[PDB]
Amino acid sequence: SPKYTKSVLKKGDKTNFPKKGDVVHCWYTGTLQDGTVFDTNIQNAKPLSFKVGVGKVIRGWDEALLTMSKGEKARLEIEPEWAYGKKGQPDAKIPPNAKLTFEVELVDID
Amino acid sequence: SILWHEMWHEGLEEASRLYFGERNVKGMFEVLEPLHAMMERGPQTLKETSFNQAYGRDLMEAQEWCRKYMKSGNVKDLTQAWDLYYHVFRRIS
Ligand SMILES: CO[C@H]1C[C@@H]2CC[C@@H](C)[C@@](O)(O2)C(=O)C(=O)N2CCCC[C@H]2C(=O)O[C@H]([C@H](C)C[C@@H]2CC[C@@H](O)[C@H](OC)C2)CC(=O)[C@H](C)/C=C(\C)[C@@H](O)[C@@H](OC)C(=O)[C@H](C)C[C@H](C)/C=C/C=C/C=C/1C
Numbered sequence: 672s673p674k675y676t677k678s679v680l681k682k683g684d685k686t687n688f689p690k691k692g693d694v695v696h697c698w699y700t701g702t703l704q705d706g707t708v709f710d711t712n713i714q715n716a717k718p719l720s721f722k723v724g725v726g727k728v729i730r731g732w733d734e735a736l737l738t739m740s741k742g743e744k745a746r747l748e749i750e751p752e753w754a755y756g757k758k759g760q761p762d763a764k765i766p767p768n769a770k771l772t773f774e775v776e777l778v779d780i781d
Numbered sequence: 782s783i784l785w786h787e788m789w790h791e792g793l794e795e796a797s798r799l800y801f802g803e804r805n806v807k808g809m810f811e812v813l814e815p816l817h818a819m820m821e822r823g824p825q826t827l828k829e830t831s832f833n834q835a836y837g838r839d840l841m842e843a844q845e846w847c848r849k850y851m852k853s854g855n856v857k858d859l860t861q862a863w864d865l866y867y868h869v870f871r872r873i874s
Binding site: 709710720758762763764 | 804854856859860871
């Protein structure tokens with residue numbers, strides 16, 4: 672009943688997983704169905720950091736990160752209900768009811 | 782608060798809630814405008830001066846990218862603006 676699927680591209684250390692309230696640091700690339708890259712923070716560049724499990728990011732990320740170990744690179748396919756839903760994010764070229772694909776690399780856990 | 786780091790920390794977070802959460806760019810600008818105006822009045826204390834030295838350039842450039850975005854609609858401009866606001870937010874914690 673999660674509304675995302677995860678495919679592991681590179682394994683993490685299988686030991687250190689983010690917990691609710693931890694700050695995580697990530698590299699990512701986000702794509703639409705046709706492979707359009709709507710954003711990447713991969714090159715001044717530095718990892719995205721946020722406190723996990725408290726709604727700082729879309730639900731698909733908030734839930735998926737708890738299942739990744741440090742160093743893991745994974746492909747996430749997130750259903751619109753756990754991303755931007757009916758409204759989408761027009762300014763960022765995300766349409767209504769869009770399934771989002773992210774490659775996410777978990778670099779560190781504070 | 783009258784501390785610039787606290788005023789900007791609260792303002793950036795609220796501005797981002799209004800923009801990303803509420804999809805409310807008008808509201809976002811109403812929160813940011815006073816803070817940028819404060820910067821344009823200039824620092825008046827030791828701590829305001831130190832804050833301006835550290836973050837003043839990044840904050841003014843964020844505003845410039847945002848103004849560029851409001852005429853271009855180009856996501857590149859939007860993202861450069863928020864990258865700078867995010868940077869300042871994280872550095873002041
Ligand atoms: C320059 O690039 C943008 C990110 C872009 C925006 C557009 C989207 C396509 C995208 O390209 O990211 C993207 O790829 C995406 O969908 N992302 C980013 C990577 C994590 C997954 C997802 C996301 O949730 O973004 C997030 C999504 C867009 C909005 C949030 C979704 C969850 C929802 O509950 C929140 O409601 C509030 C809003 C954006 C973020 O990851 C940033 C870090 C977090 C926030 C803005 C909020 O948590 C905010 O809450 C008030 C904060 O507490 C922050 C820390 C306050 C500071 C001052 C603001 C920093 C702003 C940083 C902005 C950044 C880096």
